[PDB]
Amino acid sequence: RNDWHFNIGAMYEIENVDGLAEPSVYFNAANGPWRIALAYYQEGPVTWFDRPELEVHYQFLENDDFSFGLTGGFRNYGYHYVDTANMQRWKIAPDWDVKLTDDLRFNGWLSMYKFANDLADTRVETETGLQYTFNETVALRVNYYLERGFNNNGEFSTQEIRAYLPLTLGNHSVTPYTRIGLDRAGHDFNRVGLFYGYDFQNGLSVSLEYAFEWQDKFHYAGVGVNYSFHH
Amino acid sequence: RNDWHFNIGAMYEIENVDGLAEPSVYFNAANGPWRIALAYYQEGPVDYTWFDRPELEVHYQFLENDDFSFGLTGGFRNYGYHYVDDTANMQRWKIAPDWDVKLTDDLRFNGWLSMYKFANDLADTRVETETGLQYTFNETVALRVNYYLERGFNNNGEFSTQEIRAYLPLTLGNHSVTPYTRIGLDRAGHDFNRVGLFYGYDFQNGLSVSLEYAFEWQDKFHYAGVGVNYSFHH
Numbered sequence A: 001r002n003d004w005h006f007n008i009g010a011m012y013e014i015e016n017v018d019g020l021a022e023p024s025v026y027f028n029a030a031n032g033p034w035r036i037a038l039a040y041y042q043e044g045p046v047t048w049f050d051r052p053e054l055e056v057h058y059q060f061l062e063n064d065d066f067s068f069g070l071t072g073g074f075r076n077y078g079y080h081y082v083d084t085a086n087m088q089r090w091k092i093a094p095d096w097d098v099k100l101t102d103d104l105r106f107n108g109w110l111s112m113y114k115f116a117n118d119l120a121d122t123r124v125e126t127e128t129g130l131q132y133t134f135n136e137t138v139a140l141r142v143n144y145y146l147e148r149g150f151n152n153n154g155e156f157s158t159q160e161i162r163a164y165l166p167l168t169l170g171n172h173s174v175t176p177y178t179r180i181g182l183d184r185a186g187h188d189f190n191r192v193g194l195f196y197g198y199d200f201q202n203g204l205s206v207s208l209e210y211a212f213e214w215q216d217k218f219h220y221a222g223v224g225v226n227y228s229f230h231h
Numbered sequence B: 001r002n003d004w005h006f007n008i009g010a011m012y013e014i015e016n017v018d019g020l021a022e023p024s025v026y027f028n029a030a031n032g033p034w035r036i037a038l039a040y041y042q043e044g045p046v047d048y049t050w051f052d053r054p055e056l057e058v059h060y061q062f063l064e065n066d067d068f069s070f071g072l073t074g075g076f077r078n079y080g081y082h083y084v085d086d087t088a089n090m091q092r093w094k095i096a097p098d099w100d101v102k103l104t105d106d107l108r109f110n111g112w113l114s115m116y117k118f119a120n121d122l123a124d125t126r127v128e129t130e131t132g133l134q135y136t137f138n139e140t141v142a143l144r145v146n147y148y149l150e151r152g153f154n155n156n157g158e159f160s161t162q163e164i165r166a167y168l169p170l171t172l173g174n175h176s177v178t179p180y181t182r183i184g185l186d187r188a189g190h191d192f193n194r195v196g197l198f199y200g201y202d203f204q205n206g207l208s209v210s211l212e213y214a215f216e217w218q219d220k221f222h223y224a225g226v227g228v229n230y231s232f233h234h
């Protein structure tokens, strides 16, 4: 009688200006607070690599006024080229949502990455901000986003302000979003894009995302399917 | 040739106004970033209902360097309770980020956040955090002002503890002296206060002693404790 969530799904993504094809298969299960995610991803020209990924999530607390949980995960980048060099990534993320006002909400995730051999390299990636909620269907989100590599050798900073406007009307999800990359070591850059999604009400859903980015034109386009069965 | 830190130590603590005796044994080892801590603690009424804490703890220090440093602890503790009017147990899982960040040559923004989840008998999420600023005068002297919060979450329920804490760590020769005060702001809004002195000594051979005296009030409270720690490396 014990309630499980079994999701399985896959995504195809391509980024062009030729390009990168990105097959993605994933599935995950959930019991009460606990959740487990396995995923396999691969990157190649249509030199390549693949991502085995395991992830666990414990949701400590979920209630209106405050909610938070913690993700761990392991990923492996097998690189194959034109010899098999591998790189591992350990990820610990706190993720939270906090109630300020009926509209206002302070939430976000913080991610602590540690990279294994071949290729120290600590990394912090964070997206945290405010969600204003207009009504059931519409909400605005402005986040601060930062990725930092730490400490020849070394790494640098990425800073962006992101804005999404999630729109849920009937079976459709529409989420326009922009990323304004701030200086972040240098000059301005920009991503804009639309995230469409659809739900057939039966556990099947589709995800279509288009994005343009520039500094240097960039075209991202991707699709996905997900099936949700419970128990 | 591989560098380990083996520490072992114990502490005796008593809190009175009768009172609570608190035997504590602990030891831990460290390799590069990684560290492991085991500890056993016990709480009971002396003479001139109790419980005991088995505790395991792991710490990964991701980054240590002047300008920025951080790491993450996890740990498991078990409170065996034994009583008078049957052995009921309670488990506690702890995930703490801990950080230190460089603002200025003097100023430093650091602290730890702790996420507790409690197991059966007796949900109960808990957040405990101490975060603040460290001003550094010189090698020997530094001031620390932190914000401290403990929160239990969501008959049934829990409440808030809020405090501002101040320590003045003083390292002169072999001696550590750390006066500290805790001004408890909130519970339901009554005021309360702890004051205390933390003495410590190092014999330079790996042995060290820790003597701490504290008074607290709202309701007088007397805490006194001692400890020894031995550090051998490799």
Ligand SMILES: CCCCCCCCOCCOCCOCCOCCO
Binding pocket: B008, B009, B010, B025, B026, B205, B207, B228, B230
């Ligand atoms: C887990 C037990 C921790 C130790 C218990 C403390 C109570 C009495 O122990 C006193 C230990 O004193 C001996 C210190 O070690 C010898 C000194 O080492 C210096 C030689 O280089």
Ligand SMILES: CCCCCCCCOCCOCCOCCOCCO
Binding pocket: B001, B002, B004, B027, B028, B029, B036, B037, B038
């Ligand atoms: C609470 C447990 C904390 C520590 C207990 C585990 C002790 C294991 O330590 C073993 C130390 O190192 C193992 C072998 O040492 C390296 C030998 O080879 C190096 C020379 O090439």
Ligand SMILES: [Cl-]
Binding pocket: A108, A127, A143
């Ligand atoms: Cl987000």
Ligand SMILES: [Cl-]
Binding pocket: A135, A136, A137, A138
């Ligand atoms: Cl509406």
Ligand SMILES: [Cl-]
Binding pocket: A163, A164, A165, A176, A177, A178
């Ligand atoms: Cl937008």
Ligand SMILES: [Cl-]
Binding pocket: A175, A177, A195
């Ligand atoms: Cl998106």
Ligand SMILES: [Cl-]
Binding pocket: B024
């Ligand atoms: Cl202790």
Ligand SMILES: [Cl-]
Binding pocket: none
């Ligand atoms: Cl404790």
Ligand SMILES: [Cl-]
Binding pocket: B110, B111, B112, B130, B131, B146
């Ligand atoms: Cl602290």
Ligand SMILES: [Cl-]
Binding pocket: B166, B167, B168, B179, B180, B181
């Ligand atoms: Cl003081």
Ligand SMILES: [Cl-]
Binding pocket: B011, B210, B211, B212, B225, B226, B227
């Ligand atoms: Cl002490």
Ligand SMILES: [Cl-]
Binding pocket: B223
């Ligand atoms: Cl104490």
